[PDB]
């Protein structure tokens, strides 16, 4: 899986200036969220050029999703149940843009009700 997701992230981060999310990799390589998070963790290292501002969220025990802004004093250190890089930001401002994504087979949870046309 390596050398492809890394290349896609590099292109989407530098060839065209646009923040990348893990959902983009779910749409691209049709892989699970855990694999995408592992890919972000792998890409966070072995990078000498710190041209991006990583965005990391915190999943608390009470499902209190919080975006880390200070990166110095995160309250309730022991209450965090999950931590991963939400997105890579080439600048301070995030302002993400959302469009139509054809999620044909990238779903991890599928509703019991199907879609019928005509």
């Amino acid at each position: 899986m390596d050398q492809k997701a890394s290349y896609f992230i590099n292109e989407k981060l530098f060839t065209e200036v646009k923040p990348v999310l893990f959902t983009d990799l779910i749409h691209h390589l049709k892989i699970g969220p855990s694999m995408a998070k592992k890919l972000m963790f792998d890409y966070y290292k072995q990078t000498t050029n710190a041209k991006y501002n990583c965005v990391v969220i915190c999943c608390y025990k009470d499902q209190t999703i919080k975006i880390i802004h200070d990166l110095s004093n995160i309250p309730q250190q022991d209450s965090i149940i999950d931590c991963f890089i939400y997105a890579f930001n080439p600048m301070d401002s995030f302002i993400p843009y959302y469009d139509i994504i054809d999620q044909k087979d990238c779903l991890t949870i599928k509703n019991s009700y199907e879609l019928k046309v005509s």
Binding site: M35, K37, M40, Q77, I80, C83
Partner: peptide, 19 residues
């Protein structure tokens, strides 16, 4: 925190072929 949490990813129950 990143190396404590994300490094030890379970990477399980995410086949995505049969959601």
């Amino acid at each position: 925190l990143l190396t404590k949490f994300n490094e030890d990813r379970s990477l399980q129950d995410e086949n995505l072929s049969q959601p």
